[PDB]
């Protein structure tokens, strides 16, 4: 039944390439000096603090989903035994991402306010719908739809939350928290690339007409998740004037998620004009 894995008998060179990239980029939240952000956490308003905790409690839920259900659901559909091993790394690192959010709470935040943010996330309708839609495709019978959902979640949907530490970084606030988030972002950039690459490889062994159906499904799923994420952004950033800037950052990342899957960008330049300070926070 089970055969011994041979890393000197590589079928797809990308498997080894991504294995080496992900494993050598290993990190833990303890390696980041988060304690240096306490003086900066003080200067933030109650609104900004509340927004911060609600963002990370939301991201904790979705990273837990990727760890428990997300990555493992892709394993039976792996083309190579080396892909199975790479997915084991991906699953583990999702637990590291989710763990790192608790490290931010433990260092900077008060237990009372954190528990309130957890409760706020549980009752939030757009976050729960997002979780449900993505999870339903993971439990489905279509291997390719699982890959679409995974790419859409962490190459696009996550950036409604990722925007905040990037904005604080440009204002010179919570720089260490932003560094930790950039380590997560660096992981997800490879995750989306790899899963998207394996999506396109599996698209080669299906009919021309079936490719057109799945292209239509992808843009349908994107726009369903997009409409939901607009509501999620409105409810999160309600007490701030940043709503429009996050939505432009969403459209920008939505295009990148489509490019990972090998599709044309859907959103035009005028809808995807991100504040230059956010882009500079990504790439210094």
């Amino acid at each position: 039944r089970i055969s011994a894995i041979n890393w000197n008998k590589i079928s797809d060179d990308k498997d080894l390439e991504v294995w080496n990239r992900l494993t050598s980029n290993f990190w833990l939240p303890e390696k980041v000096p988060l304690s240096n952000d306490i003086p900066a956490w003080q200067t933030l308003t109650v609104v900004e603090q509340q927004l911060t905790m609600r963002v990370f409690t939301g991201l904790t839920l979705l990273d837990t989903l990727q760890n428990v259900i997300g990555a493992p659901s892709l394993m039976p559909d792996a083309l190579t035994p080396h892909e199975e091993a790479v997915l084991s790394n991906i699953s583990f690192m999702e637990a590291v991402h989710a763990r790192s959010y608790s490290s931010i709470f433990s260092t900077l935040c008060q237990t009372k306010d954190v528990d309130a943010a957890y409760a706020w996330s549980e009752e939030n309708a757009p976050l729960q719908r997002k979780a449900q839609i993505i999870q339903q495709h993971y439990r489905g019978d279509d291997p390719l739809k699982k890959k679409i959902a995974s790419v859409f979640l962490e190459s696009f949907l996550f950036y409604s939350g990722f925007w905040l530490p990037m904005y604080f970084s440009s204002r010179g606030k919570l720089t260490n928290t932003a560094d930790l988030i950039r380590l997560i972002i660096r992981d997800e950039a490879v995750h989306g690339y790899y899963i998207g690459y394996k999506y396109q490889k599996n698209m080669e062994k299906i009919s021309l007409g079936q490719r057109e159906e799945l292209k239509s499904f992808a843009f349908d799923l994107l726009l369903e998740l997009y409409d939901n994420e607009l509501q999620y952004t409105d409810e999160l950033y309600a007490e701030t004037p940043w709503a429009d800037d996050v939505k432009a950052f969403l459209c920008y990342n939505a295009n990148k998620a489509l490019m990972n899957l090998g599709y044309e960008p859907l959103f035009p330049a005028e809808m995807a004009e991100v504040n230059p300070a956010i882009l500079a926070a990504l790439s210094p």
Binding site: K14, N20, A189, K256, M259, A269
Partner: protein, 129 residues
Amino acid sequence: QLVYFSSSSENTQRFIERLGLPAVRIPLNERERIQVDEPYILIVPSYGGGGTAGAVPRQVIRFLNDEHNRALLRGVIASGNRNFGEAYGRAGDVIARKCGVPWLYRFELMGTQSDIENVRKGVTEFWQR
């Protein structure tokens, strides 16, 4: 003209296909011949690992090791992803500093329509000067 490299994922390949301009590809196979006669701008993706970052792909190095190819190089465009931080388009400036050519443009993955528009206008104005 244009010379480019693209891995089996083919992000740069799809960029050139949507660009429309005539270009020659540096072969994906390691042991294949590649020579160009007309002056060119190079388009390279970045592949930096960890410590000793080999951001420039092996095929591009083997291509630039040829003295005839290197002499016709005039500019470099970098492909990649902003999510890698300071390493965004790392292959661009590495070749730019080694070969003494200017680093012109940086884009992500297969490039948006804005990236295609900026390259078309950037390339044509570059050759006329």
